[PDB]
Design a protein around this ligand. Structure first.
Ligand SMILES: Cc1ncc(COP(=O)(O)O)c(CN)c1O
Ligand SMILES: Cc1ncc(COP(=O)(O)O)c(CN)c1O
Ligand SMILES: CC(C)C(=O)C(=O)O
Lengths: 365, 365
């Protein structure tokens, strides 16, 4: 693509009524509390306007905005971590920028310079540094969004777009820093994405249809959805997380496996990070390969499965203890195996994310 | 008295700044020009607020609005026609209401009373009746929209929603009384919807991903996209229209066939109308059955194809003269069969829609 929008931006406008911050231990359900400022950048015929940090405020959109009629919208999700020493760091933000730009191109939305956006986010997080908690397992969620915005009903490439970023302080995913497993509903009737589709982009359209399915999972007594694909019932991803299986494969070899990027699953940043980390250790086979329900079943009977977990920004490494498939509950022995791999992954990530050990994956303040 | 807003139209706020009506220079371009008023209804914990007809104005949305992060958005599209007798009438609006409510339920958005919405739309059109054109082949396009509007980043059932309707005066589908055919790009690389997905609901998320594909079609010299599905390359729908084929099938029996409502395609109101009409005549076989590229190819060279066309609100019966499949340009003999069936359908629909012959399909003013 081409380039635009930069570092030196159309200033800062600070809030006149800084909101009261969550209180120790009680507060924040995820995504309900927002900080004082936000980033906004407009794009049109004149190209990109100047970036701006402004008080958190509502958006003003023409009723025919393509963002609301034809889902010309994409978003990202990443976290900034504060380790007392009060230093704040973003976890591998570049991968989120790479992903956002790919999503933008898929929807014919305007390209932007990945590094300028990162610096702009850096400046915003800076203004709201104090919203960044520091208690154990807490963080600041960063939500960048790009939407089409042509006041036209034709389905077409917008000639106007808006980019914005808001922040949410977040509690520790696991109550008081424990770790609890989830149960998953695995029903083939449900299909999140298709080959040749857009499941590998973080487009809002991928999410809206899952609301009803997640409701079913709850009614069937499960907490999240394990999305299956194909006549083969391949495991693809779980909820808003990639899925991993640690077991002794059929050839007698102990491995950490996860579905490959074939176009149906989202290239998760945590997923890539767990692959990287495990390969680096070099203690067992690490591979990206298709996993089927049929293989999972035979593995569980022979006692070859050690741990199964989801990976994502919300819950970096999430153990799974049960899967309800075809009306029959499969017990997943994850917790009775430690869960050793999961705990090491969490510790390594904690040490890296909270600055206790230097690492190129972290981006300062 | 129900958990639905009531045509208890929270007064009308007439406009204090009328827009200039499309000037004599007759340049009606689809969905670019809007009328003076709009309908707006808000929903929350207390339920549906009172319906309101207000001046056309921008929407005010919280930056975390679920409509913009997770595509909790759906819409409709229908037309009001003005006869020479000057009466305005809506074409089978009830089917659009049924479809809108189905879409709403799929996205866990609030249910509403179909008849109340229809009446509110009726009142809206009445206010802006002077915007309804009456030159040949013109009409008033009605765009109802329902969006989630929770100021929360959690992917979940919104607790706040907004329903609105805007109107667009529309020119003739290409202002030259004679139907011009379109060419379509048929490439299996692009997949719009899938079995078990949401292709049978009018959700904005279905459209965003087509923008890039429609650009390719142009880049390749075609005007619209014929969406294929399966290893079998089944014809599904074309652009924003259902597809029909009139030919002598493989049994030598003359017939009109269109893909069935298997969940992959949108149940078009015009489509259903053409089926009904053809059904009623009883002059030839009318069926809903799978159509494959292999069968079309084999028929185009067995010389059994008479006419192929798309059907939709924008272009009710649209002839097709060419399909580019695999670098292969297939000539479709539609126009040389002097769009006999297409012409008859156009003739009948015009007489019904413009009030020249009374019909239960039309809804007054
Ligand atoms: C469908 C889906 N799959 C996987 C993930 C995990 O991605 P990440 O590690 O980048 O947060 C997410 C969360 N973005 C997701 O929404
Ligand atoms: C994908 C798609 N299919 C079919 C149609 C035709 O539907 P209708 O006849 O109700 O306009 C449309 C236009 N609404 C469409 O967008
Ligand atoms: C371009 C218009 C026809 C569209 O978005 C639709 O009707 O679905």
């Amino acid at each position: 693509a081409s380039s635009s929008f930069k570092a030196a931006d159309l200033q800062l406008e600070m809030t006149q009524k800084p909101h009261k911050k969550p209180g120790p231990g009680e507060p924040l359900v995820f995504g309900k509390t927002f900080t004082d400022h936000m980033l906004m950048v407009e794009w049109n015929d004149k190209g990109w306007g100047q970036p701006r940090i402004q008080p958190f405020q509502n958006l003003t959109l023409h009723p025919a905005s393509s963002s609301l009629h034809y889902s010309l919208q994409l978003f990202e999700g990443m976290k900034a971590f504060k380790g007392k020493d009060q230093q704040v760091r973003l976890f591998r933000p570049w991968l989120n920028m790479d992903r956002m730009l790919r999503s933008a191109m898929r929807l014919c939305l305007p390209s932007f310079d990945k590094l300028e956006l990162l610096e702009c986010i850096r400046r915003l997080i800076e203004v709201d540094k104090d919203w960044v908690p520091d208690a154990a397992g807490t963080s600041l969620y960063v939500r960048p969004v790009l939407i089409g915005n042509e006041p036209s009903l034709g389905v077409s490439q917008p000639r106007r777009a808006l980019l914005f970023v808001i922040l949410c302080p977040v509690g520790a995913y696991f109550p008081g820093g424990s770790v609890t497993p989830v149960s998953l509903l695995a029903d083939p009737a449900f299909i999140r994405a298709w080959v040749g589709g857009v499941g590998n982009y973080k487009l809002g359209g991928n999410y809206g249809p899952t609301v009803l399915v997640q409701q079913e999972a709850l009614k069937r007594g499960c907490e999240q959805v394990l999305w299956l694909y194909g006549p083969d019932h391949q495991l693809t991803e779980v909820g808003t997380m990639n899925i991993f299986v640690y077991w002794t494969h059929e050839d007698g070899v102990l491995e950490l496996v996860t579905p490959p990027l074939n176009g149906v699953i989202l290239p998760g940043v945590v997923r890539q990070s767990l692959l990287d980390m495990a390969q680096t250790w070099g203690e067992f086979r690490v591979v990206e390969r298709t996993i089927t329900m049929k293989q999972l079943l035979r593995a569980l009977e022979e006692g070859r499965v050690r741990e199964v977990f989801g990976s994502g920004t919300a819950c970096q490494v999430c153990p799974v203890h049960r899967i309800l498939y075809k009306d029959r509950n499969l017990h997943i022995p994850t917790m009775e195996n430690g869960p050793e791999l999961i705990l090491r992954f969490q510790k390594e990530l904690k040490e890296i994310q909270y600055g206790i050990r230097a690492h190129e994956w972290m981006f300062p303040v």
